[PDB]
Amino acid sequence: VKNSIIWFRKGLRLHDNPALLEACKDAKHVYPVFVLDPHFLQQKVSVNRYNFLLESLEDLQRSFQARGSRLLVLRGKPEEVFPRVFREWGVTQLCFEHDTEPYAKVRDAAVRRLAAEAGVEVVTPISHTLYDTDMLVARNGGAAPLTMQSFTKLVDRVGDPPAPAPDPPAAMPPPAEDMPSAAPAATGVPTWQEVGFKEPPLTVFKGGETEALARLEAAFQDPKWVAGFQKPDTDPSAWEKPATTVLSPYLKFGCLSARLFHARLLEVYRRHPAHSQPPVSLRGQLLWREFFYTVGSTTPNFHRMAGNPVCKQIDWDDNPEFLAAWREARTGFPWIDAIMTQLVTWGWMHHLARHSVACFLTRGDLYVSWERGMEVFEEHLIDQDHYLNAANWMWLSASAFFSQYFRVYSPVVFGKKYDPEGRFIRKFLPVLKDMPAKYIYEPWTAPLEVQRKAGCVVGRDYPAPIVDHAVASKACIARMAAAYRRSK
Numbered sequence: 001v002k003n004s005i006i007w008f009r010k011g012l013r014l015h016d017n018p019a020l021l022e023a024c025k026d027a028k029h030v031y032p033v034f035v036l037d038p039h040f041l042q043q044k045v046s047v048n049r050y051n052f053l054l055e056s057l058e059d060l061q062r063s064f065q066a067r068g069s070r071l072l073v074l075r076g077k078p079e080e081v082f083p084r085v086f087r088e089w090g091v092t093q094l095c096f097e098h099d100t101e102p103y104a105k106v107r108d109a110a111v112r113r114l115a116a117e118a119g120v121e122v123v124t125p126i127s128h129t130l131y132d133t134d135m136l137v138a139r140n141g142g143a144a145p146l147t148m149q150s151f152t153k154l155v156d157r158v159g160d161p162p163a164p165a166p167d168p169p170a171a172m173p174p175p176a177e178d179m180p181s182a183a184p185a186a187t188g189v190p191t192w193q194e195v196g197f198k199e200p201p202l203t204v205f206k207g208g209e210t211e212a213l214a215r216l217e218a219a220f221q222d223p224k225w226v227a228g229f230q231k232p233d234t235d236p237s238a239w240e241k242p243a244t245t246v247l248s249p250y251l252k253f254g255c256l257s258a259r260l261f262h263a264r265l266l267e268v269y270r271r272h273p274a275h276s277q278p279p280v281s282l283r284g285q286l287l288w289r290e291f292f293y294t295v296g297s298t299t300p301n302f303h304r305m306a307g308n309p310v311c312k313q314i315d316w317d318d319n320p321e322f323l324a325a326w327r328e329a330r331t332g333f334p335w336i337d338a339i340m341t342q343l344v345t346w347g348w349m350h351h352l353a354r355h356s357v358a359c360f361l362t363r364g365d366l367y368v369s370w371e372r373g374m375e376v377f378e379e380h381l382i383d384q385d386h387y388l389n390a391a392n393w394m395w396l397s398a399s400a401f402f403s404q405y406f407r408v409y410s411p412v413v414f415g416k417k418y419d420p421e422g423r424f425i426r427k428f429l430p431v432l433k434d435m436p437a438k439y440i441y442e443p444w445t446a447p448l449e450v451q452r453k454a455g456c457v458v459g460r461d462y463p464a465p466i467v468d469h470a471v472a473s474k475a476c477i478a479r480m481a482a483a484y485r486r487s488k
């Protein structure tokens with residue numbers, strides 16, 4: 001008989017899951033498995049992103065149960081767990097979605113070796129990206145493109161992505177009964193308290209395939225908005241209704257299929273001929289994700305500066321003081337502190353909000369290494385993606401892909417163009433809620449009598465600015481210019 005395992009790591013969904021469809025074909029029993037490490041926080045990760053993962057597992061649990069099955073959350077390391085379950089469950093096939101991350105390549109190579117020793121077939125379809133990224137590299141002469149223009153030119157020569165896979169059957173082969181490793185008390189989805197977190201999550205975005213498909217439909221309620229979408233023209237200060245789709249954490253964990261997203265965009269584009277084109281269009285935003293996945297997977301040390309052949313070697317500063325202020329939302333610039341507060345409370349910010357805090361910390365004002373700011377983003381973001389966090393930090397620090405270091409965002413004027421009353425600032429910085437709009441972006445300039453009336457004395461209830469942007473930006477621009485010549 002055929003007994004199969006469908007191993008979830010990413011791709012936490014039932015729709016467009018060819019690994020799940022292969023595991024179900026002719027199978028007597030299917031074991032849907034996610035492997036959890038209960039010594040993780042005993043080593044980093046915020047409760048916001050970890051609870052997002054737990055909610056996504058609870059959604060899969062309810063989906064498998066509605067189909068007569070059950071999700072199995074196995075504790076331990078896959079190298080130790082899978083050899084045990086292969087013999088206990090009589091496994092003949094193991095299926096999981098391909099993953100191009102560095103740790104995944106080393107982990108999956110070991111499990112593939114263990115499956116071969118136990119006579120288990122391994123099926124690893126590609127479904128996290130739009131295309132087989134290795135095929136895109138092979139079709140471009142054996143190397144990845146380093147510009148969005150050349151990459152968009154390649155995918156148009158390749159053609160459309162594969163269509164999304166069909167839905168799984170309405171009834172699934174359940175896991176076998178009375179199997180000791182599949183006991184319900186040891187395979188259940190844990191809460192955020194049981195894993196060791198103390199403070200509760202504060203984000204407003206709930207995990208799961210159900211939420212992802214609901215938010216996908218909500219975005220497609222207005223086909224004109226989708227068709228004319230232009231990323232640079234979107235409002236970073238909108239928080240009651242964000243200006244972009246906010247599908248990033250669902251695409252990160254695989255709660256939503258990029259191939260399904262893409263297929264729904266093409267349905268709309270065929271009916272709106274004046275639709276926006278890449279790179280600013282919504283399809284172009286998926287292509288940004290595909291571009292960085294393709295470059296990073298084929299580039300060694302993509303997340304670091306040393307040994308990264310695409311990243312410029314800049315003599316970034318070792319300033320723990322400046323980093324702490326940026327990390328703790330106490331820079332003295334309300335626009336920057338408000339965004340850093342949205343980071344630790346929501347785990348998500350608009351792309352141009354991320355631009356402001358990243359430029360400020362790196363090539364704009366503080367001259368702290370982009371790896372340091374990434375580490376802070378890797379902790380709090382709920383859409384934290386290995387390759388995407390990297391390339392955008394190297395972009396904003398002007399270490400790769402981007403080189404216009406004379407373009408420096410002002411931590412005062414940038415948000416004032418979108419939100420002159422400071423609506424966004426008052427929401428995430430309630431200490432400045434009574435400050436008149438004329439000073440809310442520059443509270444140190446307000447008369448003391450205005451500061452006392454508004455109940456916000458600079459240096460007592462809100463800190464003075466850590467740097468003079470005019471002086472700090474001039475120094476940073478000169479150091480970047482001198483670094484671009486010694487790089488040759």
Ligand SMILES: Cc1cc2nc3c(=O)[nH]c(=O)nc-3n(C[C@H](O)[C@H](O)[C@H](O)COP(=O)(O)OP(=O)(O)OC[C@H]3O[C@@H](n4cnc5c(N)ncnc54)[C@H](O)[C@@H]3O)c2cc1C
Nearest residue numbers: 244245246247248285286288289351354383384385389392
């Ligand atoms: C310093 C910095 C760090 C970032 N780190 C991450 C990260 O860890 N994870 C992450 O998903 N994105 C990251 N981004 C990219 C981008 O800001 C987010 O993808 C975007 O804010 C998500 O919002 P959305 O889903 O509403 O995007 P939309 O504009 O609605 O785009 C749809 C999808 O396209 C993809 N996408 C959009 N913009 C980009 C981009 N610039 N690069 C790559 N893919 C993109 C995402 O999958 C996104 O969900 C980072 C950007 C910066 C400047």
Ligand SMILES: [Cl-]
Nearest residue numbers: 409410413414
């Ligand atoms: Cl600006």
